[PDB]
Amino acid sequence: PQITLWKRPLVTIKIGGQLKEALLDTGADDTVIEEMSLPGRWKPKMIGGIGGFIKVRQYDQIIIEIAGHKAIGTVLVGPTPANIIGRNLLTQIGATLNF
Amino acid sequence: PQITLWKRPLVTIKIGGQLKEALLDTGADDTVIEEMSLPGRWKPKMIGGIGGFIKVRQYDQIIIEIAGHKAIGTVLVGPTPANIIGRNLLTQIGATLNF
Ligand SMILES: CC(C)(C)NC(=O)[C@@H]1CN(Cc2cccnc2)CCN1C[C@@H](O)C[C@@H](Cc1ccccc1)C(=O)N[C@H]1c2ccccc2C[C@H]1O
Ligand SMILES: [Cl-]
Ligand SMILES: [Cl-]
């Protein structure tokens, strides 16, 4: 689709067998989701936002469906104020910024 | 342009007669720039992201060019970790997300 920016660009995602709403975020290097369970090994990571850093769990090779489009990549899980789809997964669904 | 997301979507902006680098950020509601002088009066604002909130100065109706596209709108100034062009100005320059 073509998504305008009048409002936050929120879409439905399927991750870990769950449906969530998430923000398509070209400013985010990484994908960060609120607390949930994910399969496999993880390792801790610190990620920095406009108000400083938070600690998250990094899970690799996680399959996600983003507004109907499948991808695989790293997903960070922690106390984020918003579910965020970052560039690591936006590239995979073919998302571009156009003007 | 059509900007892919394999790297950060950084562009040159011009504000106050000076060129700066800034991030085109669909996850940002507002536009925030590192400390600089702007004309007129300012209003208080708090903006929240990962990590928490920061206090910024809100300046309205500021002339800014974004990748050569002219805009006039609200620019926040404060201790942001990065110059960010948010949706208030991305809409002015006609930007969309497409996949
Ligand atoms: C991976 C992670 C998510 C941690 N990245 C970021 O937070 C990066 C940080 N960098 C910088 C960085 C920081 C540290 C280290 N390297 C890089 C600058 C750009 N942000 C991306 C932003 O788009 C993130 C959003 C998240 C959010 C959306 C809605 C509600 C809460 C949080 C963000 O912070 N947006 C906020 C925002 C942003 C600007 C102006 C106003 C507002 C309000 C709000 O929309
Ligand atoms: Cl990845
Ligand atoms: Cl591509």
Tell if the CB–CB gap between A8 and B24 is shorter than 8 Å.
Answer: no
CA distance B17 to chain A (A): 23
Cα A60 to middle of ligand 2, angstroms: 7
Distance CA B20, CA A92 (A): 29
Give CB contacts under 8 A, 24+ apart, made by B52-57. Answer: B52/A49, B52/A51, B52/A52, B53/A51, B54/A50, B54/A51, B54/B78, B54/B79, B54/B80, B56/B32, B56/B80
**Ligand whose nearest atom lies closest to the CA of A64:** 2
Q: How far is CA A70 from the centre of its chain?
A: 13
**Which residue from A11, A23, A25 has its CB within 8 A of the most atoms of ligand 1, so it is best to mutate?**
A25
Q: Does A64 touch chain B (CB under 8 A)?
A: no
Domain ranges, residue B39: 1-99
What resolution (Å)?
Answer: 1.4
Question: What was the experiment behind these coordinates?
Answer: X-ray
Number of structural domains (chain B) is 1
Nearest to B15, CA basis, from B58, B75, B82, B87: B75
- In this structure, chain B runs to a length of 99
Atom of ligand 1 nearest to the CA of A80: 32
Tell if the CB–CB gap between B97 and A95 is shorter than 8 Å.
Answer: yes
Distance CA A87, CA B9 (A): 10
Whichever domain contains A52, its CATH number is 2.40.70.10
Beta bridge partners, B65, equal: B14, B70
Tell if the CB–CB gap between A5 and B91 is shorter than 8 Å.
Answer: yes
B/e letters for A4-41, b = 16+ CB within 10 Å, e = fewer, are ebeeebebebebbeeeeebbbbbbbebbbbeeeeeeee
Cα A92 to middle of ligand 2, angstroms: 9
Distance CA B59, CA A49 (A): 22
SS (H, E, C) chain A: CEECCCCCCEEEEEECCEEEEEEECCCCCCCEECCCCCCCCEEEEEEEECCEEEEEEEEEEEEEEECCEEEEEEEEECCCCCCEECHHHHCCCCCEEEC
Distance CA B81, CA A27 (A): 12
